[PDB]
Amino acid sequence: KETAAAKFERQHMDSSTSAASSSNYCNQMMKSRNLTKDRCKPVNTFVHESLADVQAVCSQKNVACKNGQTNCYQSYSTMSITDCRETGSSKYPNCAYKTTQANKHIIVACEGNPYVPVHFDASV
């Protein structure tokens, strides 16, 4: 099956654009990345950076995750991100999202060898 690392890339990475370019970004990306196939995922974040720069966060500032695990890491620099949040008119299978662009530090959980991001915890 799909690995956790591959799932992180599919859910969270968009190195092909520098920022969201329209209000439709989230609607298109949530669909195209198969995040709405079984249900409308309520929230998601996309990161507009190179994969290598995001993978490198696993060697940056170790912090507790929101749930208390200690395999989380905060990026030293801010990154370009897009937050996607379900709107009041969303109704499966026509899932609908508000797009918000931001520049924030990211917090990810890392696992494995090579030690890579497997979960997006927060932006701060």
Curated annotation (Swiss-Prot):
GO terms for molecular function: lyase activity; nucleic acid binding; ribonuclease A activity; RNA nuclease activity. Disulfide bonds join 26-84, 40-95, 58-110, 65-72. The active site is at residues 12, 119. Glycans are attached at residues 1, 7, 34, 37, 41. GO terms for cellular component: extracellular region. Pancreas. It is found in: Secreted. Substrate binds at residues 7, 10, 41-45, 66, 85. GO terms for biological process: defense response to Gram-positive bacterium. Keywords: Disulfide bond, Endonuclease, Glycation, Glycoprotein, Hydrolase, Lyase, Nuclease, Secreted, Signal. Its EC number is 4.6.1.18. Belongs to the pancreatic ribonuclease family. Interacts with and forms tight 1:1 complexes with RNH1. Dimerization of two such complexes may occur. Interaction with RNH1 inhibits this protein. Monomer. Endonuclease that catalyzes the cleavage of RNA on the 3' side of pyrimidine nucleotides. Acts on single-stranded and double-stranded RNA. This is Ribonuclease pancreatic. It comes from Bos taurus. The lineage of its organism: Eukaryota, Metazoa, Chordata, Craniata, Vertebrata. The gene is RNASE1.
